[PDB]
Symmetry: D3
Subunit: 143 residues, 6 copies
């Protein structure tokens, strides 16, 4: 699970699904050569969202964030490849889409903060934690 078999969790948020950017987002990961190892669309249960965002529980927007994230379907994915965690982090852009650079996903599609289209694990460790949280081992397919 290192080097070339490194993995990360990527999720298209409710705004991204409703604005119909799912294909657009996947093309960017595909053209970069990553391997799609797991994928599903679902309405995330608040219990999963709470653990996902557990370290923001204190923040005052935490309650609003949880409601928003469960307000519509989400598309969860697991991508595999060399440097996939840091590369995906660079592709998405700054949390604040309005400040994100053109060329990044938030920079080309969004202008909001909570509605910033996509999520990606911020570290190898966090990716291992998030992937176990959103996926059962049986849903991951290794090529």
């Amino acid at each position: 699970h290192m080097g070339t078999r490194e993995r990360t969790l990527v999720a298209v948020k409710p705004d991204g699904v409703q604005r119909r950017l799912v294909g657009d987002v996947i093309q960017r990961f595909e053209r970069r050569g990553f391997t799609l190892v797991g994928m599903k669309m679902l309405q995330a249960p608040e219990s999963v969202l709470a653990e996902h965002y557990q370290d923001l529980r204190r923040k005052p927007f935490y309650p609003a964030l949880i409601r928003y994230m469960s307000s519509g379907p989400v598309v969860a994915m697991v991508w595999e490849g060399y440097n996939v965690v840091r590369a995906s982090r660079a592709m998405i852009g700054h949390t604040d889409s309005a400040e994100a650079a053109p060329g990044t996903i938030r920079g080309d599609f969004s202008v909001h903060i909570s509605r910033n289209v996509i999520h990606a694990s911020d570290s190898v460790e966090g990716a291992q934690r998030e992937i176990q949280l959103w996926f059962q081992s049986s849903e991951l397919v290794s090529w």
Copy 2:
């Protein structure tokens, strides 16, 4: 009920290995259809056999099951007005080589065998296929 019509679309193992999933999904998205279900999975042979029961007594059935289980497939459920027939016209001819440019097979495939994608051929076929690949709790209506 008209605009509640649904259909099953699946990217075959070759479409996934060739990294055409985003390309495929994008075509349905810009046409205005709603994605109500989706998942990547290694298809079990019991599902393929039921999915392809009508070809069980035709030539090359074993080659067919072999291909469809040689790697993961991405199954999707799209919803929209006249979605069954429109999805049919969009994927094009079975024989990719003679599929018209502009359709998915005409733009991305060259073979009859490995033809990248599958779409239900009728409303009743769609109802059957959807129940076959998805549980009701996997479909989200938005």
Copy 3:
């Protein structure tokens, strides 16, 4: 005079709300046509009635005027060799659901009613429509 041929193209209210203006314009641009006039406007009913006078005695005329004035439209004048017939072939069948993939309706629309775009059906129709939506001082020849 051949390569001075002109036609009227208009993105309907649904095309604008769905944000397909760039997509539409891009298809005409890469085909090599010259954009000689363009503007976004909420169409006045007097203009629509004159534009659609031939449908005044057919079913659903009121539904037609209602749709076409439910939001802004983008009217354009394109110039080029055989532009009237080429623009016609590019937008595809009136019934979007049976429009061939590759045409604008076949790629972006699913309905007969809301079919995203309009293009003059003939040279004389184009001359009429252009005079209807634009003043001569709004056309720029480059």
Copy 4:
């Protein structure tokens, strides 16, 4: 006319129209979620151009700039949306296209300075001034 109803003026310059980049430019504003509120193609009158570029009147290239800008049709547009002024400014890139970053509009399409394809208001205040200058209130349509 604040927050979510913020507006800005965007213009495709003569080079952009002749090189047939109008569709390309509009797609980028559309995919980012902005709302097209006004639009027209015209040969700008030198009187409008002089006021538009009024604070460069002293510069020695000012006379050349005015001639160039009226040498061909221009497409003027008004876009509306949250943070639309700063977001549009980031999407266009550095005045000098050759130095503009890939992903920005000047960075992907141009390599010149006066022929840098596009213009966008540099501030909320300037946008209010420019929109009144290029458009009559009756040409703007609010959704």
Copy 5:
């Protein structure tokens, strides 16, 4: 040998001046064909005359040679299953104006004369054309 089939594709002078080379190559690439040879060159008249020997006794031959030598062309050799007929269907009708949208001529061209691209019309024609434009040491099989 089936998947060893080859064909000659060439972007005409207008396709190059209009900067459509990447667009053209991209369509063949996503279809899955393999590029085994390519070069940009100002075509010698002896090559054009041999390439177009069948049109030597038809109207407008001189206008044809003039156009094809008015600027550089990009010649390519693509390899793949049924590549001759598929490349034929992808470029579309000779008369660009009536070429279906989705094909290269239908999307990028409007004239019969200047129709952007050329593709061998048959397997034997392809063998002939390839030998005409390329030396064996310029073809790389990968």
Copy 6:
């Protein structure tokens, strides 16, 4: 051979050709307005590669690099235009693709170092040297 007639050498590496990114790469140079002045696909002879990469001969990866670069076909091109050398350099991105910015060619398509899809002359002087090395004068066509 200055200003507007400036030229540079661009090459699509073996990985770029096999992953079928040739069209993608050319579209980016075309849309920016450059003029394609020379082009050919070939299996570069180790003798050409050695001179191309001559100033890395001391490095320990030099031998591996030469083998890799001759392991498959390469597409060589000469592009002409104002500021074409510096503009092409900015379009390709950082040597390490994983660190390259989204929007650059390496930033959108690669995640490796030696397999970073493309090469571009790093200076006007180097471009003159590289173009003479890969092309004979008769293969270049001026419009």
